[PDB]
């Protein structure tokens, strides 16, 4: 039948979808959510055999184990076990586009399990098997007999095995196909894997059972009263003695309960549902659920007989909350939300797409610790435990249907085709049927990047009809179609319009007020965090805070989809597209996370934490105004620590308890701050501390901070005249300057400081020269390739202009003796094919104190692409252990990504001044630095800098971080100016104009001396 | 696989749906809609074999003809050939309700055909087979190889046979299943049949072909300009030299043309449709389409090469019209419609559900001739020729999806189930894909009686998305749900509310103004024409005309679903539910038409024609005001004939040409009418005549009429005193009255006139006695049964009260002699178990002229159900050929159904005074009669009457008209009063209060004499 090549057949003998079941036969266990003897896990060691196609599978496999098979753990993706290669492709389908057909050579995974089934399970009731996730399609056999078929890799497929099981030994045979017609709806930008990657289990239900139940909570105007409504459905034989009791619990206290026989209200001319009943419980002053305070109740659903005999019980956590859009605003419990979200794929560097509780908990803790309050299930229903955790820890969730047809041309070719409506409807409807009782789910999503088709409108309406408690959104076809309650664009910029034909991405501020538009706007994806990114992040948040209808968005994305591979010595390294022989592929594009695959944070995470803070501050005189952005909670676990320091030197500090009502303000009067004697800039730093630990954070957790420049005293005191005076020796090839054991050498041919001596020790390995380029960031490269150049990409414009090829041409080099110092003057012209790109004019002034003052003045041709940087660089001979500096830090920060950085005195080990981005590029910069110390060296001024054992050249010639090798000495890049990194997206220039080096003329000065 | 027991599989290898194709290879042929050499018909003689189940079919059948098979005509329903019984069931499913399963004993029809195929059809292109209708599911094999499967009995299933055919002879094998999961969605109230009941054909298309095309027409505010937009889609190899040309023709005049290469506009990020193109043609002053004037243009779609070489051409008729709902009104070309519709099932008394052109044309002509302008396809897509005819003859059509699950409990059990969405969507989407280019289709319907489920909302939105040119309606779940643009109730009454729980049927006038309601209201079904019905029809039309938002409705229904059977002697008769051994069944309920199965009109049709007239009249003095209800046409084929008559005697007449603009008025001044000498009532009668013949009517066709009472001269002249005097001979047992050769005999024991003589010739066969009952009409019976009594039905209330058992008890009987006459006085009491139901007091006065004046005064107990009638009856010995009367006629008319009847002198053969309703009951009544003549008899007064060879008793004891037998003499029923017949529905009392005999006391007088 080749059911895997027919969108008309998405399953065979599959049971109806429903909320999580456990079939407890004890009410107390259901109330407390303890394990159930009726729900058994079949996870563990299974037998596995790989085949090139289903036609290659031997019939004997259905009867008994294949001796060639191996024993492997399940759940798992067989690519992670090495049976075949995982494929990383973004848009382009991994298979030829010829729906509904797939390749004849279709990798087939044959799984099998011999397990015991107790007689008692077969004597009565129904025994079903549940596959929470099988990628992408599969046939099931039990004890040699065919049971069924199923599609949709991200939702559970259940089958009744009651008639196939025998007391004792039983054997399951599961033939999993890598490709199927279902694959046409699973073109998400991620690794393409397959296998039984989610839990497998057995559930025993009585013949007369609870087959489904829906929980809803409605409120009065002030939420002081609520009505919990529970619709319960049954299957089996109806008897008048049957009953349903729904009890609601607050901890161990029962707050309400309702009991009734089956038989719903009349719905039409033929009557009502005899096999259904709806219980309604009144709740006074319910404790409301939110990501701020995840208050939860326990709802226990008991199916029993009138005389009190329990048949079975099911249950779920209940969160009393209302989600609604009113007057253009998305409200939660009557208050306008501000979504601090992030998109999160289910990815593990070692296990592939198999999820586990520990990894899920780790992600949630890091998310809340970094001020996120929402997550989008990009782009498919998640592992069931995820929603349970989000309910309890408190995170707003966008549950998304597993539908993405990005590679189609046009994108809506299938979604607008009525023949594909059946396949699509199952992916939407079964998701809703499964997750509708989770309070954390506040919005439904029709899928991702599948254009806009009539199928979307039909399914949008279906959800509005079955579940009016949640808004429905969908970005396809322009982000504001008739299939979405929320304007949810991806990568729309703050102020800049991108007028693409048919599907323009308007500035978000402009989008809101388009003629006739009234909906709220929340980006489903924004701030592409690929590599050294997140430049301009603060621009989004300033807009979110100023515009009521701009209610946030979800960053793209949480974690890099890099995979682990090993070298000959067994050392693991991070791999991406193409590293498994997979081709075609989209290389680095699978890595766009705020954290590395092992959950180690990228520098950008801190920028997100800061901009997403829940407390805002303003300074006026001695008064600090604290404003709360919390909607429901008071600041009852917050303390404000303040500190004043003069150039890193603390002068005063203290702490004040925070008592701010949600949306409220608090005024904190700072004590009389003493005036510092020494000259310099006084800085005020405040930070909110959480004294007590929480379920998601440790005691002392810092949730927010802010800095302000206070009084400044300009230094007007002249340095004590050094009785000493430098000496200038002159040869026809050099200009030397000595002062004690110190010597400065200037090559009169190149015009650069080629060497410095402190005794008999050389200080430089490479001359001090100007630098106007940087090892290209992912944002500088975009989608440009060696065989497919994107002339519009920054890196391509720099290359074409000759910025990387430019040769320094000496125009002038002179030296002069002053009453107390030696003056060296140089002038260079960087050209490319007769074109003068830059002109650098410098003056070096060495005085009796051994301090070298370097003054640089650069001219940039107005018609050459703006340079990535304007600074100097050299390879120092020294290799010290620490790097001490007075400037923005402690983490890596760039011009358009430095709001989170604080000004102070920082000291770190050299290795921390390098950011291990899987794909190497310019990195580790620190801006607004007034003083830098390394080894015996000290540089003073106002510059940006990065320092490491890797040259810009090696960084731009290496594709993977594990291939980098520490060079001799230490490479130092000191810039007077540095271009922004951008990030609004990573496939087109995204560096805002104000962060481009377009002034035409630049000036900066440095002072080099021995610390 | 048992695909017929899986709603997940509704087809296998079926081609996509699309508008009618013919694949012309000559553009002129396509323009003229002449037959296409590429579209062949396979209709004719096929081989057929019946089996009790699919498992009983021999494998050899796939290879060669079964010698036991018979040769039968196709299309056809095998029940009509006698292979098994057709089943008539209304709501209750004909099979056990256990979705998706059907009976194991599943009648299976094995059809096969050996046919030839020109080799040229196989040398190039694609050859497909098309089954326009197969009831209910089927598998297809070609030359022994399995081709595909298909469901949905009312839409075409197409399969590509290119790879299965050979030159010369080929053999098709079609296994048709009577029951399938599809049957759960086909529970319409009609005969349940099966087989290949619609055309079968072969279509040849080129490899590069037109695969679909959509035509739309948009207009400016005053419809003086239009833009015809044609989207054309292709399949096959794309080449830049391919072109599509769309030409629009008005007769033999090409009004517009457009040519372009393939390649649509950009729709999303992935581009646009390279395999599509949209042509836009401007049309100035387009001739608009409407049911009033069906103006049509011809659109020819040519797929060709740049060098002008034609590849293929398709085409369709185009009607320029706009359908939209604005401010609560349904508008057609900017004007509010008034729907004069009727529901029409595809039914033929001999061929079952097989439709043919002649029958379709006959129905359309009769419909338009009786002032109908709209038809509803109850309850499934019709034979494709139907829409073509409606486009050309001019009728508004409601195209309805083949979805009805009436027998489910509750009614929406399947429609609210997401697992049934796939099956449902195919029935809606494939209908739209097939009929969207027909101008006659102005509204889409989601189906019928399937409650209201989320599936309905999803499909409602799908249509609004793919075709915004037509409103969508659906009655299920309350008639005003979120799945309907029109409030479309069935059997909602005019003034009376029917507050059923959940799905009330409010008075239509009240429905319109319910809080928040703004939609237009058009009944999808009203005025149940079952048997002697349509009482109260005028009440609906008075409301439709007074309320702008009450825009009409569709009568239920067009033709009786009676079937022909032959007795032993091979004589045909009309049969209904149960007559084929089918059980359970719903008997007479399959007959609700305005016309008999053979299209002979029921009396009610004329009432509909009259109330649905397009011209309204008012009389003021000598002025007749004519108002036109036409929206677009002028009365350019209308003449007004007027006539004045005194008691049937014409005095003056004439004709005036009608010149009325749509919605306009015309004043016609009647000449000075001469005053009649004789006493009596002058009557004015006007009628609109169509001098010229049309496509739907003959010259002289009468489209409307109206009557008014003019001056009346009461007779004050006393009759010439007769020179004779009757004699009274009194005996113990009798009261005799003699006059010449005439004798009157009053039985003193019974108190009734038992005999009258004229010589030796007896006048009566049965005494003249009071009558207060009638042979129950279908509306009197409702759903009451012998084994399932409905105590609320009129017939049951009459029976329970003893109205049919009541015995006359003589209270007084006297004789008197007057100066010029003899006076007989009687008094009777009709009782039942000690209860006096009625009291009848009479006086008979016989004078010298031989005239007998009868005065009757009846008392009706206020606590007994109101009587069906109050009159006298007797069996006359005479049997004359003609019946002459001065009263309402000429056709049967009742108190609540007599507006169409005219007052005049009528003369008909006795047989026409009897209405052959298949189910016998009271019939043939004529109201407002002042004089009745039959044989030598003449009755004068003001009464209602019926006269025939069938007694009320025989009529109420006979189930079928063919079992009736003319009794001796003639039965005469003369009523002073008669109860209304009702009809708002036929399952609950529907006779309006004003037509119930509830006065308590009645009086009427008659005069019996010789003509
Ligand atoms: Mg499939
Ligand atoms: Mg994508
Ligand atoms: Mg700051
Ligand atoms: Mg089926
Ligand atoms: Mg029905
Ligand atoms: Mg009249
Ligand atoms: Na906002
Ligand atoms: Na990506
Ligand atoms: Na606090
Ligand atoms: Na690099
Ligand atoms: Na009206
Ligand atoms: Na009926
Ligand atoms: Na005329
Ligand atoms: Na009868």
Chain position carrying tokens 């006979």: B958
Question: For residue A451, is it left (φ>0), alpha (ψ between -120 and 50) or beta?
Answer: left
Facing B451 at nearest CB: one of A12, A268, A482 = A268
Give me A709's structure tokens: 């420049």
With CA atoms as reference, report the closest residue to A411 among B263, B270, B266, B265.
Answer: B270
Measure the CA–CA gap between B738 and B726, rounded to whole angstroms: 5
Task: Decide if A267 contacts A256 (C-beta within 8 A).
Answer: no
Q: Do B503 and A451 touch (CB under 8 A)?
A: no
With CA atoms as reference, report the closest residue to B410 among A265, A16, A230.
Answer: A265
Give me A767's structure tokens: 């001359």
Residue of A nearest to B500 (CA): A269
Distance B706 CA to ligand 6 centre (A): 5
With CA atoms as reference, report the closest residue to B633 among B333, B341, B299, B340.
Answer: B333
Burial category of B857 from C-beta neighbours within 10 Å (exposed 0-12, middle 13-18, buried 19 and up): middle
Chain A residues touching residue B426 (CB < 8 angstroms): 418
Order of strands, sheet of A310-318, starting from the edge strand that comes earlier in the sequence? A253-260, A242-250, A297-305, A310-318
Phi and psi at residue A748, to the nearest 5°: -75, 0
Distance A448 CA to ligand 1 centre (A): 21
Q: Do A410 and B268 touch (CB under 8 A)?
A: yes
Q: How many residues does chain A have?
A: 1011
Q: What is the DSSP string of A861-875?
A: -TTSPPPSEEEEEEE
* Angle formed at CA A403 by CA A400 and CA A406, multiple of 5 degrees: 120
Order of strands, sheet of A145-151, starting from the edge strand that comes earlier in the sequence? A11-12, A145-151, A137-142, A168-177, A108-117, A44-51, A70-74
Chain B residues touching residue A11 (CB < 8 angstroms): 8
What angle, 0 to 180 degrees and rounded to 10, lies between the N-to-C axes of helices A384-393 and A357-369?
40
Q: Do A429 and B421 touch (CB under 8 A)?
A: yes
Q: What is the DSSP string of B387-427?
A: HHHHHHHT-EEEEE-S-B-TTSSSTTTTTT-GGGHHHHHHH
Long-range contacts of A363-367 (CB under 8 A, 24+ apart): A363/A558, A363/A559, A363/A599, A364/A389, A364/A390, A364/A393, A364/A395, A364/A696, A365/A393, A365/A696, A365/A697, A366/A595, A366/A599, A366/A601, A367/A342, A367/A395, A367/A558
Using CB atoms and an 8 Å cut-off, which of residues 538-567 of chain B contact chain A?
none
Q: Is A714 on the interface with B (CB under 8 A)?
A: no
Using CB atoms and an 8 Å cut-off, which of residues 256-275 of chain A contact chain B?
265-274
Q: Do A502 and B409 touch (CB under 8 A)?
A: no
Question: What resolution, expressed in A, was reported for this entry?
Answer: 2.2
* Residues 6 or more apart whose Cβ sits within 8 Å of residue B954: B920, B964, B965, B967
Q: Is A231 on the interface with B (CB under 8 A)?
A: no
Distance B915 CA to ligand 14 centre (A): 13
Task: Decide if B335 contacts B326 (C-beta within 8 A).
Answer: no
Ligand nearest to the CA of A637: 9
Measure the CA–CA gap between A830 and A860, rounded to whole angstroms: 10
- H-run or E-run covering A285: none
A917 known ligand binder: no
Chain position carrying tokens 């320091």: A645
Measure the CA–CA gap between B470 and B464, rounded to whole angstroms: 8
Give me A949's structure tokens: 């054992």
Give me A981's structure tokens: 């990194």
Our CA dihedral for B290, B296, B300, B301, rounded to 10 degrees, sits at: -10
A965 known ligand binder: no
With CA atoms as reference, report the closest residue to B704 among B603, B605, B613.
Answer: B613
* Angle formed at CA A621 by CA A619 and CA A623, multiple of 5 degrees: 60
Q: Which of A449, A638, A796, A922 is catalytic?
A: A449
Question: For residue B320, is it left (φ>0), alpha (ψ between -120 and 50) or beta?
Answer: beta
A406 known ligand binder: yes
Measure the CA–CA gap between A92 and A411, rounded to whole angstroms: 11
Using CB atoms and an 8 Å cut-off, which of residues 432-451 of chain B contact chain A?
433, 449, 451
Task: Decide if B604 contacts B534 (C-beta within 8 A).
Answer: yes
* Angle formed at CA B699 by CA B697 and CA B702, multiple of 5 degrees: 70
Task: Decide if A205 contacts A143 (C-beta within 8 A).
Answer: no
With CA atoms as reference, report the closest residue to B231 among B175, B121, B314.
Answer: B314
Q: Is A15 on the interface with B (CB under 8 A)?
A: no
Q: Is A994 a catalytic residue?
A: no
Bridge partner residues of A140 (DSSP): A148, A174
Q: C-alpha A690: how far from its chain's center?
A: 25
Residues within 5 A (CB) of ion ligand 7: A 544, 547, 550
Q: What is the DSSP string of A799-857?
A: HHHTTTT-EEEEEEEEEEEETTEEEEEEEEEEEETTEEEEEEEEEEEEETTS-EEEEEE
Bridge partner residues of B191 (DSSP): B88
Task: Decide if A205 contacts A126 (C-beta within 8 A).
Answer: yes
Measure the CA–CA gap between A368 and A352, rounded to whole angstroms: 24
Using CB atoms and an 8 Å cut-off, which of residues 95-134 of chain A contact chain B?
none
Domains of chain A: 1-206 (2.60.120.260), 207-321 (2.60.40.10), 322-612 (3.20.20.80), 613-718 (2.60.40.10), 719-1011 (2.70.98.10)
Bridge partner residues of A205 (DSSP): A126
Phi and psi at residue A550, to the nearest 5°: -95, 100
Q: Is B16 on the interface with A (CB under 8 A)?
A: yes
Give me A286's structure tokens: 């319910």
d(CA B113, nearest CA chain A) in Å = 27
Q: Do A409 and B270 touch (CB under 8 A)?
A: yes
Give me B595's structure tokens: 């016309």
Q: Is B408 on the interface with A (CB under 8 A)?
A: yes
Measure the CA–CA gap between A104 and A107, rounded to whole angstroms: 9
The three-state secondary structure class of A495 is: coil
Task: Decide if A467 contacts A444 (C-beta within 8 A).
Answer: yes
* Residues 6 or more apart whose Cβ sits within 8 Å of residue B59: none
A934 known ligand binder: no
Q: Do B410 and A270 touch (CB under 8 A)?
A: yes
Give me B90's structure tokens: 């209304």
Measure the CA–CA gap between A421 and B463, rounded to whole angstroms: 13
Distance A629 CA to ligand 9 centre (A): 15
With CA atoms as reference, report the closest residue to B686 among B665, B664, B662, B670.
Answer: B670
Task: Decide if A898 contacts A539 (C-beta within 8 A).
Answer: no
Distance B876 CA to ligand 13 centre (A): 50
Distance A689 CA to ligand 9 centre (A): 9
Ligand nearest to the CA of B340: 11
Q: Is A186 a catalytic residue?
A: no
Phi and psi at residue A980, to the nearest 5°: -65, 165
Bridge partner residues of A303 (DSSP): A244, A312
B526 known ligand binder: yes
Residues within 5 A (CB) of ion ligand 10: A 920-921
What's the start-to-end Cα distance of chain A, in Å? 80
Q: Characterize the bridge pairing of strands B550-555 and B339-343.
A: parallel
Chain B residues touching residue A414 (CB < 8 angstroms): none
Test the A interface: residue of B93, B238, B265, B270 with most A CBs within 10 Å: B270
Q: Is A852 on the interface with B (CB under 8 A)?
A: no
- Give percent helix, percent strand, percent coil of chain B, each to the nearest 5: 15, 40, 45
Ligand nearest to the CA of A561: 8
Catalytic residues of B: 449, 525
Q: Is B11 on the interface with A (CB under 8 A)?
A: yes
């Amino acid at each position: 039948r080749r059911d895997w090549e027919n969108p008309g057949v998405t399953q065979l003998n599959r049971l109806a979808a429903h909320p999580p079941f456990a079939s407890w036969r004890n009410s107390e266990e259901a109330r407390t959510d303890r394990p159930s003897q009726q729900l058994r896990s079949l996870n563990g060691e299974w037998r596995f055999a790989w085949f090139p196609a289903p036609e290659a599978v031997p019939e004997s496999w259905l009867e008994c184990d294949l001796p060639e098979a191996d024993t492997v753990v399940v759940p798992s993706n067989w690519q992670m076990h090495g049976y075949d290669a995982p494929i990383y492709t973004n848009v382009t389908y991994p298979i030829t586009v010829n729906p509904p057909f797939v390749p004849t050579e279709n990798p087939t995974g044959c799984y099998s399990l011999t397990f015991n089934v107790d007689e008692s399970w077969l004597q009565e009731g129904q025994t079903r098997i549940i596959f929470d996730g099988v990628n992408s399609a599969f046939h099931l056999w039990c004890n040699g007999r065919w049971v069924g078929y199923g599609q949709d890799s991200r939702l559970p497929s259940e089958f009744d095995l009651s008639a196939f099981l025998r007391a004792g030994e039983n054997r399951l045979a599961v033939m999993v196909l890598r490709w199927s017609d279902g694959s046409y709806l699973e073109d998400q930008d991620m690794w393409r894997m397959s296998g039984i990657f989610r839990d497998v289990s057995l559930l025993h239900k009585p013949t007369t059972q609870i087959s489904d139940f829906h929980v809803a909570t409605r409120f009065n105007d002030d939420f002081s009263r609520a009505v919990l409504e529970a619709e319960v459905q049954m299957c089996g034989e109806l008897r008048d003695y049957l009953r349903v009791t729904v009890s609601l619990w607050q901890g161990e206290t029962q707050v309400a309960s309702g009991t009734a026989p089956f038989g719903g209200e009349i719905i039409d001319e033929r009557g009502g549902y005899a096999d259904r009943v709806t219980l309604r419980l009144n709740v006074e002053n319910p404790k409301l659920w939110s990501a701020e305070i995840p208050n939860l109740y326990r709802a226990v659903v008991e199916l029993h007989t009138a005389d009190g005999t329990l048949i079975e019980a099911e249950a779920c956590d209940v969160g009393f909350r209302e989600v609604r859009i009113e007057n253009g605003l998305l409200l939660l419990n009557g208050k306008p939300l501000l979504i601090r979200g992030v998109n999160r794929h289910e990815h593990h560097p070692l296990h592939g797409q198999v999820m586990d509780e520990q990894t899920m908990v780790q992600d949630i803790l890091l998310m809340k610790q970094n001020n996120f309050n929402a997550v989008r299930c990009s782009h498919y229903p998640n592992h069931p435990l995820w929603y349970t955790l989000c309910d309890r820890y408190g995170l707003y969730v966008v549950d998304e249907a597993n539908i993405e047809t990005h590679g189609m041309v046009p994108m809506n070719r299938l979604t607008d085709d009525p023949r594909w409506l059946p396949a699509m409807s199952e992916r939407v409807t079964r998701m809703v049927q499964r997750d509708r009782n989770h309070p954390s789910v506040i919005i439904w999503s029709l899928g991702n990047e599948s254009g806009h088709g009539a199928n979307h409108d039909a399914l949008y309406r279906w959800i509005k009809s079955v579940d009016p408690s949640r808004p429905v959104q969908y970005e396809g076809g322009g982000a504001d179609t008739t299939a979405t309650d929320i304007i949810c664009p991806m990568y729309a910029r703050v102020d800049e319009d991108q007028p693409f034909p048919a599907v323009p991405k308007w500035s978000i501020k402009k989008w809101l007020s388009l003629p006739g538009e009234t909906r709220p706007l929340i980006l489903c994806e924004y701030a592409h965090a690929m590599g050294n990114s997140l430049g301009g992040f603060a621009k989004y948040w300033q807009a979110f805070r100023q515009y009521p209808r701009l209610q946030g968005g979800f960053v793209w994305d949480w974690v890099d989809q890099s995979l682990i591979k090993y070298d000959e010595n067994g050392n693991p390294w991070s791999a991406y597209g193409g590293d498994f022989g997979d081709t075609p592929n989209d290389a680095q594009f699978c890595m766009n996370g705020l954290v590395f695959a092992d959950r180690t944070p990228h520098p950008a995470l801190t920028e997100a934490k800061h901009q997403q803070q829940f407390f805002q501050f303003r300074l006026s005189g001695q008064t600090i105004e604290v404003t709360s952005e919390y909607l429901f909670r008071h600041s009852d676990n917050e303390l404000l620590h303040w500190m004043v320091a003069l150039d890193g030197k603390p002068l005063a500090s203290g702490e004040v308890p925070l008592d701010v009502a949600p949306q409220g303000k608090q005024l904190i009067e700072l004590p009389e701050l003493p005036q510092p004697e020494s000259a310099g800039q006084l800085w005020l730093t405040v930070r909110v501390v959480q004294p007590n630990a929480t379920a998601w954070s440790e005691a002392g957790h810092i949730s927010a901070w802010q800095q302000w420049r206070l009084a400044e005293n300009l230094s007007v005191t002249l340095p004590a005249a050094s009785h000493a005076i430098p000496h200038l020796t002159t040869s026809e090839m050099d200009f030397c300057i000595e002062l004690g054991n110190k010597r400065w050498q200037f090559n009169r041919q190149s015009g650069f400081l080629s060497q410095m001596w402190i005794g008999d020790k050389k200080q430089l390995l490479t001359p001090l020269r100007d630098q106007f380029t940087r090892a290209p960031l992912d944002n500088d490269i975009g989608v440009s390739e060696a065989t497919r150049i994107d002339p519009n990409a920054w890196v391509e414009r720099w290359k074409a202009a000759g910025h990387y090829q430019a040769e320094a041409a000496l125009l002038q080099c002179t030296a002069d003796t002053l009453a107390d110092a030696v003056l060296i003057t140089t002038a260079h012209a960087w050209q490319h094919q007769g074109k003068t790109l830059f002109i650098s004019r410098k003056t070096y002034r060495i005085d009796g104190s051994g301090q070298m003052a370097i003054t640089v003045d650069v001219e940039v041709a107005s018609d050459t692409p703006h340079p990535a940087r304007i600074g100097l660089n050299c390879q120092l001979a020294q290799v010290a252990e620490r790097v001490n500096w007075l400037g923005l830090g402690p983490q890596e920060n760039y011009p358009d990504r430095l709001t989170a950085a604080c000004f102070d005195r920082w000291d770190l080990p050299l290795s921390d001044m390098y950011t291990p981005y899987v794909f190497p590029s310019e990195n580790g910069l620190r801006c607004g630095t007034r003083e830098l110390n390394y080894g015996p060296h000290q540089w003073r001024g106002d510059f940006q800098f990065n320092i490491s054992r890797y040259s810009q050249q090696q960084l731009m010639e290496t594709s993977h971080r594990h291939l980098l090798h520490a060079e001799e000495g230490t490479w130092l890049n000191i810039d007077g100016f540095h271009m922004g990194i951008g990030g609004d997206d990573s496939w087109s220039p995204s560096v805002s104009a104000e962060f481009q080096l377009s002034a035409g003329r630049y000036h900066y000065q440095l002072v080099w001396c021995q610390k």
